[PDB]
Symmetry: D2
Subunit: 262 residues, 4 copies
């Protein structure tokens, strides 16, 4: 089939990439970075993220693979020594696929609307002034948030920024999204829930400005200053990312190796 390979650009990753291509030349495998069916990422989770966003418009016809030339990653979870064996069963096809939920982000302005897809998380901070927003869940005013910002994470994103904010780690088979607070201000006057919140499919969490209508919004690795913002809208996406499964590497084992010890 068609396939392509991105690289972290360092010497190690470039050389591994040329090795796999040459190995791929020994099989029925076209190199196409336009309509590929297999996308191999070599480097770290960041390299994987870029691969994800480069092809987010053909998600349902692609199976991703991550190779970590550095430390183990949650997406780049295959060591370089397994490349040549990776090449072989990728080519002989007939592999199993696994899919993770994704986070849909909608921005409405006073123009139009902008939608984004996030594999890790989307965050909202203010443009310099104080960050204050009203939090509406399924059209009910839940809280007025005053603080540094908010973070909505996918299941697999919970080991990234979400983890640093006290969020829970959840198994990526759970179709859900998790919202955490960044340095919330709490007194008798101003009240937030404190706890992280976890939402199922079809629940819509909407942020609405109170004073400042300008917010710095991040979506995975992108960070853009949006102006004249009327609403920010979060929900579990209908789209999934598909991984090529060649081995048992449990998410919890992946969590242990990254945080307890390898």
């Amino acid at each position: 089939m068609k396939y392509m390979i991105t690289s972290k650009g360092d010497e190690k990753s470039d050389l591994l990439r040329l090795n796999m291509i040459a190995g791929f030349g020994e099989y029925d495998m076209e190199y196409d970075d336009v309509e590929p069916e297999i996308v191999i990422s070599i480097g770290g989770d960041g390299t994987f993220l870029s691969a994800f966003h480069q092809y987010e418009e053909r998600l349902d016809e692609i199976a991703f693979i991550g190779i970590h030339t550095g430390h183990l990653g949650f997406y780049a979870d295959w060591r370089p020594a397994e490349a040549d064996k990776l090449v072989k069963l990728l080519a002989k096809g007939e592999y199993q696929k696994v899919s993770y939920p994704l986070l849909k982000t909608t921005v409405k302005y006073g123009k139009k609307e902008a939608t984004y897809l996030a594999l890790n998380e989307s965050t909202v901070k203010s443009s310099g002034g104080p960050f204050v927003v009203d939090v509406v869940i399924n059209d009910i005013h839940f809280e007025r948030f005053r603080g540094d910002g908010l973070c909505m994470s996918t299941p697999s994103g919970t080991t990234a920024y979400n983890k640093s904010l006290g969020g829970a780690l959840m198994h990526p088979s759970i179709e859900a999204m998790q919202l955490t607070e960044m340095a919330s201000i709490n007194n008798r006057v101003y009240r937030t829930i404190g706890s992280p919140l976890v939402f199922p499919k079809h629940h819509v969490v909407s942020l609405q400005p109170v004073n400042d209508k300008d917010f710095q919004i991040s979506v995975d690795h992108l960070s853009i200053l949006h102006r004249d913002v009327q609403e920010i809208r979060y929900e579990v996406s209908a789209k999934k990312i598909h991984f090529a499964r060649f081995r048992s590497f449990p998410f919890w084992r992946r969590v242990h190796d990254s945080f307890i010890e390898d």
Copy 2:
């Protein structure tokens, strides 16, 4: 149908109970506290919990209802002023039901095995000495936990003890369980994940002793000192609790009213 009513035992709750029975006498409704089909709890969430455990062996033939004669509760979420209107549509049947996941707890000894069902959570602390256990997830050693204890919470339990330990609040439609740490000790020598963990159905979290084989285990409101413990076993239950639905009272609205302001 058959029905019964438990009360918090205070003057307010007893009198409301006699009122609903007398109201029930105006309908085709037998009072049976042996094989009832409707269980009404009047008081607080604790009163509801006791009602839950009193009839946990007939869960799939019962629809529960909570009335709070005190503050709003997450299970006793109907105000006393709605009792007489509650009586009427309960009697004319034809109401919708809603179900929450439950937590199965298994204890193995060096005799036999003891299983328990929890609506809020189950906790494990030590008998006085230091609490130390190895944590195995789906048969993989995940961490050696050293600290005060651990807490595994159901979805709806996440607003109770789980919340006090930094756990996330999750919507009770998510079939999952959440594990949190109690005062974990972390240094170069001893390492825990810190983050709360959220598990889907069919994942088995097993606690295994390292030195002391005696643990104080709680299951909702029960707390019993188990001796000669070989293993503690947590997983999402196959059994669900069924609620009688008479009105829209969203869980998140219930969360707002309890923690942000009513």
Copy 3:
């Protein structure tokens, strides 16, 4: 003596200010906003902060007073109804003074050095890239910090930003400074202390860049992007802020009124 009065600029605060001046005209009291001996702040703690920084070069010849025309504040802790009684004993002098510690901040560049004085706290975040610094305490490498940023707080500052980051509240009679982490990243690879740290007088906490030499540094309300930064240097200041004491209002009572209930 000489005195001056700043105002939050809102209608309420301006009118209270003219009232106190007219009241002051009934006494031996010159209005001088150049070499005053009494500085009265009317509005909130922010109004007080500005008053503090406007005159930070004559700290040892000034006694400050805060009046809150809005909610109670930790610096503006006198209600508007006590203005006219405030005017009288301020004028008849012979009052007691109280002093709080201050935080000295030094910035070294590759030009020269810039020093700043902070009444609440100073924070360090990165210019957009990832924030990474080595933390040196009294010339010993303590940790490599990777995360959103760091915050060093004075005693009285601990109820502000410090509180939002999990820092402890400490009595302002303790000559100390407290450092807290902002969303620290912790794994097997990267290790921070997590806990907040509290330092006595004469301990020097130094931040040193690893890659990016550009940091957004805040000092109370100022926030400036410093470039080509070689070192950031924190320590308890030799200078103190002096308050005019007219009544017993314990810091802990002030803490209760602001966070538990008034």
Copy 4:
């Protein structure tokens, strides 16, 4: 002078102890475990604690020393390889001393009063029922605490249990005590400060029962069920523990070695 040596009782520690005594026999040094002037602890911090409490009635005539036959400890901070060099300068006297603050704990009953001295911390939990106490600071009602319990820590104790509860680490030269919450319950109905609190000398923090008058009180390693308790009283002690100083081992270096890496 007179001296004595306690041991962790393991083979390693017993043999090191006999070595130092034999080494001590080569000097003007009497072994007296009744009125000693030098107390050497060999094992861990727990061994040191026991040594501390064994002689807490002669604190002002004793200089302590800790040797760790296991991992580095905050009190047992001398490696076994330095024993013979320890023996020599201890004997030739003329060494510097360093002192850490201690925590006084008073318990009043409906008989009399019981006082205790703590080197690490004192904790208060309930006898099985729910733990609820009113918190009075310098005779002002500060909060009604509902939760698992409270912990008051000395400066040097802040690296122990205090650290596990989110408390700050503070330099032991600061004469202060720190109070932290154990799983506090917070809602609209029940309100705690959340933040850890740090108190200077002469501030009196008093716990008073609301319903249950029975509390499990810990003081370092002791844990005793006190009944008919009218009040628990915390404050910085007038007594200090004195250490023999033979080398520069900064507390912060000690913190780094224990938590970041050795």
